């Protein structure tokens, strides 16, 4: 169930849109004075081929997945708008995890890192406890939005951008692109199936990037085919630093296991991370 907002129920402020299927605007709900992000669906008729205009299904997939999710560590969908088709999402004020980690002169302090780690873990835990489980398929640092970087804040990090997300009681397949973040069983061929355990692998890469501030696999340089082979067949993984807490190292290593079934349930992951 998703409520409908009219053009008068919200007021626009500005644009900040790097949108995949349109434009993103900042705005406010007239009722709450609540700050809000507006994601529009813009079909460029003078832009793309009839196969490219299948970004409609992405906008759709997002709406469908978002309508069932209600968790503090997942970006909330307030409602839907028409003409154009628009998603009304809560505004997350501190940017995303990818851009914040680029700032080397200002490293995130240890306690805040843990808040971020646990925040994302709780979000994904929620996703995997759904019936059927939510497979995000695009878990990476740009898709983690930062609510606050204060260690005592209610919510520090939120999971976002469920556009390529799949929710099926059966098996899910499809070759994914962004290989440095994605499970080995998702990057080799479309001809093989995978589960929500792929997200558990992606999460390990997110744990690594928070811990080191560095891009996963940035320490290596291979051609695409050689890179995919190493990850799949030779167990190529980013190097966990020697000073990393023993319990965090174990969580990361189990979460990026080549064998998907060895990647832990998030009840275990949350518990382990909370002991850090
Ligand atoms: N709820 C929100 N709160 C604050 N900013 C948001 C937001 N939703 C989107 N944005 C911003 O609007 C822009 C739109 O990006 P979008 O959400 O479409 O991801 P994307 O698909 O562009 C990631 P990539 O470029 O890697 O594919 C981003 O810069 C993001 O920071």
Curated annotation (Swiss-Prot):
Binding-site positions, ATP: 16-24, 39
Domain Protein kinase: 10-276
Residues of the active site: 138
Record family assignment: Belongs to the protein kinase superfamily. TKL Ser/Thr protein kinase family. ROCO subfamily.
Name of the protein described by the UniProt record: Probable serine/threonine-protein kinase roco4
Organism: Dictyostelium discoideum (Social amoeba)
